[PDB]
Each structure stands twice: as C-alpha cells, then as structure tokens.
C-alpha cells in the first residue's frame, strides 16, 4: 500500500496475510467464514518453476500485524485445502480475478481474526465512496514490503472514467479505486487483499487487490475485481 | 542471453498442415504471454495468435481463427503454431514474441520486446 | 478493432537532420501500451520504444516516443545513414483482445 499509515492491531481482523513455502507473504485474502478465505485468482499461477497452484504450498496466517512477529499471541496459521480460481479467470486480460481458499481447518473466531460480510448482487458502492485498502505490499513501486499492515483510504471511480483513464483494459468486473491525482493506492503484495467499506457500521467487502499500472500514478488507479458480482458464484462454491 | 530460436516452415500444400516452434531461453518463460506476428512478403506486420504466461488463455486474428491453434510448453519453454487448412495467404515469414507486460508485478505493456529469427513458410501446390 | 495510421508514408532526410513520424489511433490507446519498431530489409523488426517514451535496452538516445491519447510521435533526432528503415506502430489492447500495427513509415536517406 502507498500512501498509507499503520495499521491499528485488531482493526482488520479479516485481513489475511499468505505465505507460499521458503517465501514468505506473496498476496493478501480476506476471511468470509471460519473455513473460507477469497483471494486474487492470478496468485495461485503456477510459475517460475513454483506450483503456485497447488494449495499445500501456501500457509495462511489469521490476525497478523507485523510480518516479523508471526508467532505473536492471537496469530493463527493455517494450510490449505484446497484453492478454486474462477472458472473464467483470464491472465492475459486479469478478468475474474477472484479465487477462493479453503482452509484445511477452520479459523478460530478471537479479537484478531473476523470474517467480513460479503455484498449482494444488488449492494451499490457509488462513486465517490472512501473505502479502505489494506496489506503488507509495497510502499512504493519497485520497493519492499511492509512488515507492519498498511491501510489507506480510497474512492471508488466511476466506471466511465476509469475505462478512460486506462483504454482498452477495464472489464465490467473490474472497478478503479483510488484517486486522480495518485498518492494512495494498492502496490504488488496487497493483491488478493479486501477492499473494506464502512457502510450504519456494518462493514462490507467491496473488492479484490488485482492490478494496476504502477503504483500510486496520477490517473493509474489500482484496479481491483468487484465483489457483488461473485455473491452467488461464491455461495455455490462455499455455501457462504 | 535472451532469445527465441525458431524452427519448423518451408513448402506446404494447400489445405495441409504445418507445425511451428519457438524455443526460449534467458527469461521466465511462464511469467509472460507470447504471440506469433507474420508479414507476407512486401507487407506490414500482422498478429495472428497470442497465448497467456500460463497457456490458460489463447486469442487469434480473424484471419486465422478456426484454423491455427497456439499452445506453450512451460516445462520445455516451448511455444507452437499448429497451422491446418493452409491458404495461399499464409504464406509468410512467422516470427514468435515475447510480450512485456507482467500485471502480476503491476507492470503494464503491449510491446514485444524479444522476437525470434523468422521462418518462411510458403503454402503452394 | 484499433486502427493506427501513419504518416507519412514516406521520409527522406539527410544525415543529421529530425526525422518525425506520427502514429494516428482510431480509438484512445494507454501510453503503456503503444510501441514502436524498425524493421531493416531483411531483418526481424526489433522494438524501439515501449510505453509510448520509454526507449528499449541497448537502443540509441537518438530514438524518442512521445504522445497520448490518439497522437503518438516517434522522433529520430539526428538521423544516421544507418536508420534507412521501416518504422511501425503497434497498439495491444485486452478488452476486447488484440494486438494492431500502423502500416509503416519508411525513412530513405537523402544524399
């Protein structure tokens, strides 16, 4: 995340944090049940000669804060069982970037680890909107991740303009989130990471970290797959 | 030390069949899409096929869909052009590309910064 | 789906002189997703410029990329009798997917 501050300990208690083995943190997922994560589907490509695919080789870490201090009271690890990409993920277009993640035993619900509601088909996020991305991602293009989870608030783009501002590259599931002039956005290491909205008090997820060109650019802001879309595609999968 | 090593073309009937390869080293095969562009002779460049890092998806131009099929071997960091029902048309210098873009790494391009050597094929009875 | 058009057609300049070419979109392309190559008789193209202004490894200052939206500019500086050439534009495009070239400027060498 660029642009952003500290997290507050417990303040994301949804925001997950996955290792792939001998690697560290690669990409971000947020909980939505005691035994379902959702994540960004171009994560979990095979590549480089790693099986990025497989789910025994990732670790999900529960209610983490700081990278450095993963055995800190309240953290919880967790293997996978098993990873569903969608079935119409592209990875040239990064359309239907959105997986979800089994965890090969549930999640213990504490002060640290919540699960975040998941938005009808029908739930609205207007343009305008400030919502919050969070992760352990860069802090700035071509830099290094944080050891400390970041946030940074957000607006939500109209999909006009965002289609304008990145020609020829924005699906309908996919929303711009950000800011014109730059500053706050997303970097590589947040994807697969919640877009949460404050809505009342309820909080919501409003998106998946997937792309962007560069980070933190005026007029490149991230790109994320939008979630009202996916509920029912998520609900025949999960039964969430 | 980053290069794409073509084989395969020549003289081919028309309606048969004809399979090209390009071999690449130097680079993470996996992590980038790769295209087959052609030129006819006295003509400007024309993109026939792209395939994704992953080979999950494949695109083609009009002018070849339904009869060319590209497909990658990630493990042999291989990419082929499988022609079939071969038309006077075809006849071209193909080359293979390797794309620049890498959205993983929020690094967006179009442009094919490694291409290989070029193969002729010309399709004729 | 995309059409780039280019002009002129034909160049011819002398050694030393500014060569500028133009690349025409139909439709607004992203700067990081406009190209340009040359392309020697006999040769495979090689890319020039990517990203509408960044130069490629190994590829002389002389080569500037530069424009946006549907106006894109490909300036050769000081031009050597060895730039004698075809230079083409290509756009990518994901949705709908595609990848479209510009038909060409050639740069004859006067003398």
């Known amino acids: 995340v660029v642009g952003g501050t500290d997290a507050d300990e417990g303040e994301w208690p949804w925001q997950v944090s996955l290792h792939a083995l001998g690697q560290g943190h690669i990409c971000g997922a947020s909980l939505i049940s005691p035994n379902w994560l959702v994540s960004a589907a171009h994560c979990y490509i095979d590549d480089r000669g790693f099986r990025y695919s497989d789910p025994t080789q990732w670790t999900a870490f529960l209610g983490l804060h700081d990278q450095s201090q993963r055995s800190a009271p309240g953290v919880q690890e967790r293997r996978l069982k098993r990873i569903i990409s969608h079935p119409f993920f592209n990875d040239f277009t990064f359309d239907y970037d959105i997986a979800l993640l089994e965890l090969e035993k549930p999640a213990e619900y504490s002060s640290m680890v919540r699960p975040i509601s998941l938005p009808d088909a029908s739930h609205v996020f207007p343009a305008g909107k400030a919502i919050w991305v969070t992760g352990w991602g860069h802090t700035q293009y071509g830099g290094t991740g944080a050891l400390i989870l970041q946030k940074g608030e957000i607006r939500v783009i109209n999909q006009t303009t965002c289609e304008n501002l990145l020609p020829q590259q924005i699906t309908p599931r996919m929303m711009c989130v950000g800011f014109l002039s730059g500053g706050v956005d997303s970097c590589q290491g947040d994807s697969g990471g919640p877009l949460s909205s404050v809505e009342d008090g309820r909080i919501f997820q409003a998106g998946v970290v997937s792309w962007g060109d560069g980070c933190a650019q005026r007029n490149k802001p991230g790109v994320y797959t939008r979630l009202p879309l996916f509920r029912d595609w998520i609900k025949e999968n999960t039964g969430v | 030390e980053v290069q794409l090593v073509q084989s395969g073309g020549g003289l081919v009937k028309p309606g048969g069949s004809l399979r090209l390869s390009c071999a690449a080293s130097?680079?993470?095969?996996?992590?980038?899409?790769m295209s087959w562009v052609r030129q006819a002779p006295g003509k400007g460049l024309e993109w026939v096929s792209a395939?994704?890092?992953?080979?999950?998806?494949?695109y083609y131009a009009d002018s070849v869909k339904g009869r060319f099929t590209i497909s990658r071997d990630n493990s042999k960091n291989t990419l082929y052009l499988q022609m079939s029902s071969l038309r006077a048309e075809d006849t071209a210098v193909y080359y293979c590309?390797?794309?620049?873009?890498?959205?993983?790494?929020?690094?967006?391009?179009?442009?094919?910064?490694?291409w290989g050597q070029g193969t002729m094929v010309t399709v004729s009875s | 789906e995309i059409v780039l058009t280019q002009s002129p057609g034909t160049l011819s300049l002398s050694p030393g002189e500014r060569a500028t070419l133009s690349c025409r979109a139909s439709?607004?392309?992203?700067?990081?997703?406009l190209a340009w190559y040359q392309q020697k008789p006999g040769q495979a193209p090689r890319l020039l410029i990517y990203?509408?202004?960044t130069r490629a490894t190994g590829i002389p200052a002389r080569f500037s990329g530069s424009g946006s939206g549907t106006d894109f500019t490909l300036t050769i500086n000081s031009l050597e009798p060895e730039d004698f050439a075809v230079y083409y534009c290509?756009?990518?495009?994901?949705?709908?997917?595609?990848?479209?070239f510009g038909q060409g400027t050639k740069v004859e060498i006067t003398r």
């Open positions: 590309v390797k794309d620049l873009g890498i959205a993983a790494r929020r690094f967006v391009s179009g442009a094919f910064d490694i």
């Open positions: 990203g509408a202004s």
């Open positions: 439709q607004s392309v992203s700067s990081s997703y």
């Open positions: 395939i994704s890092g992953s080979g999950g998806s494949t």
């Open positions: 130097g680079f993470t095969f996996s992590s980038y899409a």
């Open positions: 290509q756009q990518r495009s994901n949705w709908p997917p595609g990848y479209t």
